[PDB]
């Protein structure tokens, strides 16, 4: 099923791209004026959690 498939791909890619400090995935946090270390900390955690959520829904849908 298509929504679960897309979310698995997109959350996996957001985890992977966040390992690159110069990736454009960092430019979307316009609420933060200067990305600092604790910012890159919490973001990486959140994206990780959103990947395991999407993995779980993809398993249910396939």
């Amino acid at each position: 099923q298509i929504p679960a498939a897309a979310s698995l791909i997109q959350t996996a890619w957001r985890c992977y791209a966040a390992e690159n400090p110069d990736s454009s995935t960092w430019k979307i946090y316009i609420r933060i004026s200067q990305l600092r270390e604790h910012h890159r900390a919490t973001i990486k955690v959140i994206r990780r959690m959103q990947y395991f959520v999407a993995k779980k829904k993809f398993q249910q849908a396939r």
Binding site: P3, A6, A17, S24, I43, R48, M49, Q50, F58
Partner: protein
Amino acid sequence: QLTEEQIAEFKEAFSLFDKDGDGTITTKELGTVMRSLGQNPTEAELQDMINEVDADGNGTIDFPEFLTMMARKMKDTDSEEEIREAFRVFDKDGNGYISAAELRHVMTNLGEKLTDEEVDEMIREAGIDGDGQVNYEEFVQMMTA
């Protein structure tokens, strides 16, 4: 395969979320960290995140459960197969290629909706061929390498 440097960082990260200090992460506290990063998570999303980490089922995240989440493998053979099986959804004729135009549409307009700059970077890494197609096994490999 876990150091005292790795655990110190995971413990400092755990406390950025546990605003209470009671040793436990609540949906409310997770929503507060997300909302300060400028995200607007629904309660449904916050409860799903907590429920995928909360192993014992009491509705909160203790440090051991946080550790399991941070140490859980993402680049293994089984996760590789799930991502691969996710791309096959969009490979309508099962030939190993997705149309670059179909890929960018799905990535920007379905699911979590990536930005156009995020998809530019994503599609630039696999390459588009002369025929406008993207070999998606390239994503499966470069993301799990």
